[PDB]
Write a protein that binds this ligand. Structure first.
Ligand SMILES: *[C@@H]1O[C@H](CO)[C@@H](O[C@@H]2O[C@H](CO)[C@@H](O)[C@H](O)[C@H]2NC(C)=O)[C@H](O)[C@H]1NC(C)=O
Lengths: 49, 49
């Protein structure tokens, strides 16, 4: 769900909006490099429905 | 109170073996219950996110 696709599940693959992941092999395990999109530099606006 | 230190060991070793087995049974069942509690806690951490 994260190397073979893009997941919409929140915090399943990294903190942020998941873009993609890269698997790396570790001894007796696996390491995922989760690439996410994190919004930055917010600014206040007035809004309306 | 009834037996001397050589006849008492025959009985005390029986008691020790039995009580150690009681503790072992308790700990084994606590591990098996902790696995299920951890599955439930992982599900709750997934539902939170
Ligand atoms: C969006 O507006 C709020 C409200 O003005 C800003 O929050 C205040 O920031 C000031 C510092 O400049 C604090 O002293 C206040 O306590 C904050 N809150 C409130 C309730 O007034 C907030 O900084 C603005 N956000 C952006 C990104 O501009």
């Amino acid at each position: 769900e994260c190397v073979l696709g893009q997941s919409k599940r929140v915090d399943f693959c990294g903190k942020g909006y998941h873009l993609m992941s890269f698997p790396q092999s570790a001894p007796h395990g696996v390491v995922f490099l989760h690439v996410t999109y994190v919004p930055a530099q917010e600014k206040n606006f007035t809004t309306a429905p | 109170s009834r037996l001397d230190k050589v006849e008492a060991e025959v009985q005390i070793d029986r008691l020790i073996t039995g009580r150690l087995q009681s503790l072992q049974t308790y700990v084994t069942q606590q591990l098996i219950r902790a696995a299920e509690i951890r599955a439930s806690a992982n599900l709750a951490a997934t539902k939170m996110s």
